[PDB]
Amino acid sequence: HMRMEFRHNLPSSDIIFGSGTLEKIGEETKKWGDKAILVTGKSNMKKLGFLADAIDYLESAGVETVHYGEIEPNPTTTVVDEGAEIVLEEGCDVVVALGGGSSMDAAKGIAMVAGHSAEERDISVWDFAPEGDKETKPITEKTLPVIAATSTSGTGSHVTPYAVITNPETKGKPGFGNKHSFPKVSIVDIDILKEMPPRLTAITGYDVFSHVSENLTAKGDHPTADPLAIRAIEYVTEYLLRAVEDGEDIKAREKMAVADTYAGLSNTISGTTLRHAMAAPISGYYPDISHGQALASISVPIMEHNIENGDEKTWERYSRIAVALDASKPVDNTRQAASKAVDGLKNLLRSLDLDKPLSELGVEEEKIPEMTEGAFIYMGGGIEANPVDVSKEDVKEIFRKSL
């Protein structure tokens, strides 16, 4: 018998879940600081009224608030570093996020820079970012505390340590974070999430499924993540399409928000693999491409490559995914049982209108070698976590099949 070995690490988590829990954002933020920077996107929280409510709750709690409404999707180093300058200039002592993964990550990045800085700055978020064997800047308890109110049932970021930040000079899109950038308090408000439009619901929903399916197949044992990851896939298969077709189906929104929370906790304990490592350089080189659409367009080839080069332990993991996708009845540990995960995946992608080759997104074949370099330079951990080896030419070939 093969013995089981692992180390589980999960930072403290405080999750306020329900509809109308945006109410709490002020009382909770005051516990951590008197002056917040409020990090958001440019239009939807404002248009939907939740920006005004957050500001109200924060001020009413006695938290003086500076609004930073500049996060565009796929946040950049420049936008983080400029928001950190504001934190230093205004004296903010806590970073509050109201938005999706792009806002929550930008917020964590701002907390990092501003917390480690001198008076005017002298450090960039990129100093914390992996890049080849570059020795990163340690991320320490100096990181400012982060309060995260998510608006998508998409990234898990309200309960992960990670920020995903793009450098436009290199096109890299790495993740980074640890226990000191995990949000102190996490607010999941169904009244905010249920306003996602159908397309956003489907994209962020697929992100949930992508996290947990990679978390389960990542190399080594990780049994504390696995039941959360499995249940999330069951919730995706049962509720995601319900949420897309009726945004006001509240049960379905609640299950996708629980599923998204599972995914963040599961992705903290375990980690993502090749699909994430390759989707980063796609949105890195093509910033108008949504993260989840990038994941979708390369999923089939990657799952097929991992199954073709796998072993019985990895095949059994893919067979549990197939079962959770309703693509099969019995779990088994063979190449063929595992291959049903590809059928269930295709079904999922079709029901969500996410099955698009990279061509239909605007990716061009000439970019392959650059994007392959991107994947190894900036997502080396995910390549290492993948259950089967890949060479630089494996990844080139995978990109071409996804075109």
Added chain:
Amino acid sequence: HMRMEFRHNLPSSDIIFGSGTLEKIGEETKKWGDKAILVTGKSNMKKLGFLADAIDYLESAGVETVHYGEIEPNPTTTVVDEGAEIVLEEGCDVVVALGGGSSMDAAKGIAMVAGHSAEERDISVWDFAPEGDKETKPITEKTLPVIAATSTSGTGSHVTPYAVITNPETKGKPGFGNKHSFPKVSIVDIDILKEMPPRLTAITGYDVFSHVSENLTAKGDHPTADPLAIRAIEYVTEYLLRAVEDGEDIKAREKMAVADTYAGLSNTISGTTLRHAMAAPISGYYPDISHGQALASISVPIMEHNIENGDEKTWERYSRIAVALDASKPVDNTRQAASKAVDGLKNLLRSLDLDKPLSELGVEEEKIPEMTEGAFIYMGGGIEANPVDVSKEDVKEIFRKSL
């Protein structure tokens, strides 16, 4: 549709899992202090050699160590308070546990007292303990850091905040703890656990099942605990009897240790209910009765009372328990589907030789009113968490049926 509302709170967790991970206890403990009190029982870790190894690893890591080998099962206030006096007298700055729930809880209690004390003491662990509406002493970050190496696949205590301490003057056996008494590092060593004898394996195994089955039926929503709790029941039904009948079946030991870890995390997020509230005063008044045997002997009547006074949401939870126990195929939300959990429970208890009326343990009918008082004075939270009301006379009647 009934909206979903909850707050999830889980302290930081660091779990080192494998066989031979006792190796790590010194390096890990040194991160938190230079001088440990090592809290253990009186004979088995010593006899089995693990006491000598721990001391070796601690000293070899440069952690000067004072051994406190005085924890008897069902630890008392007196034993905690005397161990705290040693911590103060010797200057210890970190508390290390090597043992079962009794040692781990005693350790947490010692960390509490010694951390909040003046020079010689002036405070008892009982000051932190619930007791009616007595205003407890707040448990704060002054609590000393705790390193927990468990030796039973039984209590979850290596990953809960709680200490369960008996006051022999009152016979109360409450639990108490929060984020500041959650172990900083948790070591699960299969080489230690696989030495549990058959009877201890079965008793502590039933404790795992008791935690997660109450965690799942506790009042309100708690979806982040539920998948861990479910998987634990699946592991109990599939491996516990294997572990009892062959202590050297390592796969089975590993699954019960994962199940026990699930239970601790699940019991931190959610909570136990009436079965635990009533089993406390049994071991409180009869300290030679094992916690898990006490739980076993009152389970059938309690499950029947909760099912008889339940609703469809609680019935559905019991039906999932029945399915996880292999007592039934389809989950359903009726009184009858739920009642199959009682059949699966009876099967479990019989396969483990735990189905004994309280009489066969030495409990006497004359004690009922005292034990009922015990349950409300000292386990009020669990009564409140139970999915159906109970009066003081409900609990008296339940005790009599279990006799």
